[PDB]
Design a protein around this ligand. Structure first.
Ligand SMILES: CCc1cc(O)c(F)cc1-c1ccc2c(-c3nc4c([nH]3)CN(C(=O)c3cnc(N5CCCCC5)cn3)CC4)[nH]nc2c1
Length: 291
């Protein structure tokens, strides 16, 4: 069932590419008659021992997850051995929520945005039960199954909390999604349920801007940082801005109670951010009040 042989994988098209790995749309066709299931397949380009260990950890996390709002794991292809593993996930033709929302915004009202928001909270609450910190919550990493269902994707950075600590410190982090990071993640590389809640605030911001390009978190933070950037890195300007209570502005058209939720997620103190359970409850009630 979870056994996939390289000889039966047929390349259909490219679906994405990072700095060290990529995603392809393949058909898994053991009958060789083109009736096989279409799947999304991840592989690494530059396979260093550390990238390999991270990839194996991503696969172990995916094997453990079964939820309606989490992308379905199918298996792994071990044909070329440990050095060239391939991860097999369900293929979702609607793609990312970031792209789907930009494409279908004329048929996606605030009530629909809140239905997606609730599903994301539910998926996140489930991750929390397993002590998993997603670390890359963003609309580009949430996938769409249909008009009524979204699923949390890209578990490439997901970490498991230590048994006795409420945070995981990442010893050696590569290129990071800084405009979605909590301040303690930027300054101390500390990741927790509370830093996933901060990122969730940024996701909610993305949704309510309807992915208007000029309003993206990098566009707004870069404008807020200003023109006079001499002497310090962008991460340094970002750390200072957030310490001085600089925040993404309220999208025009955004309900006040939704912006209030974002501002609470963006508390500088890890211990003062809302829980995903409370976020689901609040979002569900705002959505019920709208209709
Ligand atoms: C296997 C990797 C993985 C690992 C995980 O830990 C995880 F949690 C989830 C996934 C994962 C990732 C993407 C998945 C898609 C998908 N479905 C579409 C896309 N992705 C893009 N898309 C495209 O049309 C597309 C997008 N970008 C392209 N690029 C952009 C950059 C390089 C040029 C090609 C090409 N096609 C529209 C449909 N379905 N299932 C997936 C599952």
């Amino acid at each position: 069932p979870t056994q996939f042989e390289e000889r039966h994988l047929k390349f259909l098209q490219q679906l994405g590419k990072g700095n060290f790995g990529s995603v392809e749309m393949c058909r898994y066709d053991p009958l060789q008659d083109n009736t096989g299931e279409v799947v999304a397949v991840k592989k690494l380009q530059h396979s260093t021992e550390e990238h390999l260990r991270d990839f194996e950890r991503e696969i172990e996390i995916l094997k453990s997850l079964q939820h309606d709002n989490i992308v379905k794991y199918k298996g792994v292809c071990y044909s070329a051995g440990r050095r060239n593993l391939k991860l097999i996930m369900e293929y979702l033709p609607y793609g990312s929520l970031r792209d789907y929302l930009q494409k279908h915004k004329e048929r996606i009202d605030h009530i629909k945005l809140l239905q997606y928001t609730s599903q994301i909270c539910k998926g996140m609450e489930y991750l929390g039960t397993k002590r998993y910190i997603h670390r890359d919550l963003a609309t580009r990493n949430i996938l769409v199954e249909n008009e009524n269902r979204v699923k949390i994707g890209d578990f490439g950075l997901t970490k498991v909390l230590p048994q006795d600590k409420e945070y995981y410190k990442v010893k050696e982090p590569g290129e990071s999604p800084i405009f979605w990071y909590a301040p303690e993640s930027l300054t101390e590389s500390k990741f927790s349920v509370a830093s996933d809640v901060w990122s969730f605030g940024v996701v909610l911001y993305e949704l309510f801007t309807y992915i208007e390009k000029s309003k993206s978190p990098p566009a707004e933070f870069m404008r807020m940082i200003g023109n006079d950037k001499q002497g310090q890195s962008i991460v340094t300007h970002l750390i200072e801005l957030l310490k001085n209570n600089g925040r993404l502005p309220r999208p025009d058209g955004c309900p006040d109670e939704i912006y209030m939720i974002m501002t609470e997620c963006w508390n500088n103190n890890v211990n003062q951010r809302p829980s995903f359970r409370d976020l689901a409850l609040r979002v569900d009630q705002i959505r019920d009040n709208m209709a």
